[PDB]
């Protein structure tokens, strides 16, 4: 389950140590018009870099990419295909900036090839400046 880690993972707002006689979970809305899922609020996991149930505010640019790797933890590698116009040779070329993105852990089942939504914020880490805001399931996966 959870809290097989060193320091007490908690939300720095809610309480859970009062006299009675299922812990109360704090979330928020994000702006732009995005939906926090059932899985965020039904579950009991504890994370701080989420734009919904954590300390980060989404502002500036909001971009999209396609998921390539999920071998890191709480952060994914997405990829941004675009065409670059060279003025001399009136044609294009494939380039990509596979930007480092934090994996907002409210998204339970994300696969590679899923079109993600990413929002600019303050830097979470050295290269990470983005969070996951929505995910679409693979083309089938019937079994």
């Amino acid at each position: 389950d959870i809290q097989t880690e060193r320091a007490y993972q908690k939300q720095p707002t809610i309480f859970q140590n009062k006299k009675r006689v299922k812990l109360p979970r704090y979330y928020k809305n994000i702006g732009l018009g995005f939906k926090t899922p059932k899985e965020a609020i039904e579950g009991t996991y504890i994370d701080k870099k989420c734009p919904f149930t954590g300390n980060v505010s989404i502002r500036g640019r909001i971009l999209s990419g396609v998921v390539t790797k999920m071998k890191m933890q709480r952060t994914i590698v997405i990829r941004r295909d675009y065409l670059h116009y060279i003025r001399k040779y009136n044609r294009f070329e494939k380039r990509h900036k596979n930007m480092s993105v934090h994996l907002s852990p409210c998204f339970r089942d994300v696969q590679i090839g899923d079109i993600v939504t990413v929002g600019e914020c303050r830097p979470l880490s050295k290269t990470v400046r983005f969070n996951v805001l929505k995910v679409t399931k693979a083309a089938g996966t019937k079994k």
Binding site: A7, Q16, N17, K18, K19, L23, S100
Partner: protein, 206 residues
């Protein structure tokens, strides 16, 4: 000096950056406070913008909020017991943010007697014969003893604070930065937090 520059180290790919300028002042490091538990020894440090920053070097005063009923009294700090950051910061008794430090129960033992009138612990057979607490545990007005009847059924102690208030040792925590502000303020561990930071000590026992 010791810098907080982003350019002295490697890129995403691996290739090393080449420095285009020498170190700036704003990219700044000063050594860790390494603040002991002693008498109140605090050096002030000037910081960027012409402001102070209080370096605790020895510090054992600060207030801790008993989270259940929310009472807070400035208490002496006695022992650093746990630190998830480094197991060796416990040894060289250094106060940092999220140090699980011991404080005295006597300012809160005072308050719970001065509000609820219930003596805790004191192994069965032990009365108080000099008698300051027994007339704080008996002999009120006739009808405001019913105020202590409306404060009896829902003032029952926590599962494992019966075995903390008895020994005069509260597992407190530090939620300020004594290397930045020169205080050691925080709260008293309770419930599942108390069943976490005591799980981290008794698992080491056997």
């Amino acid at each position: 000096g010791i810098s907080r520059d982003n350019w002295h180290k490697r890129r995403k790919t691996g290739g090393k950056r080449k420095p285009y300028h020498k170190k700036r002042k704003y990219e700044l490091g000063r050594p860790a406070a390494n603040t002991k538990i002693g008498p109140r020894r605090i050096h002030t440090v000037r910081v960027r913008g012409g402001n102070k920053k209080y370096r605790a070097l020895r510090l054992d005063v600060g207030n801790f909020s008993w989270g259940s009923e929310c009472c807070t009294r400035k208490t002496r700090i006695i022992d650093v017991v746990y630190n998830a950051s480094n197991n060796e910061l416990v040894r060289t008794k250094t106060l940092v943010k999220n140090c699980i430090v011991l404080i005295d129960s006597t300012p809160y033992r005072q308050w719970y007697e001065s509000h609820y009138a219930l003596p805790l612990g004191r192994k069965k057979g032990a009365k108080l014969t000099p008698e300051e607490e027994e007339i704080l545990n008996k002999k009120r007005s006739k009808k405001i003893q019913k105020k202590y009847d409306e404060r009896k059924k829902n003032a029952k102690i926590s599962s494992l604070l019966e075995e903390q208030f008895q020994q005069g040792k509260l597992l407190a925590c530090i939620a300020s930065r004594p290397g930045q502000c020169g205080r050691a303020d925080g709260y008293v561990l309770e419930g599942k937090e108390l069943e976490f930071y005591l799980r981290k000590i008794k698992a080491r026992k056997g």
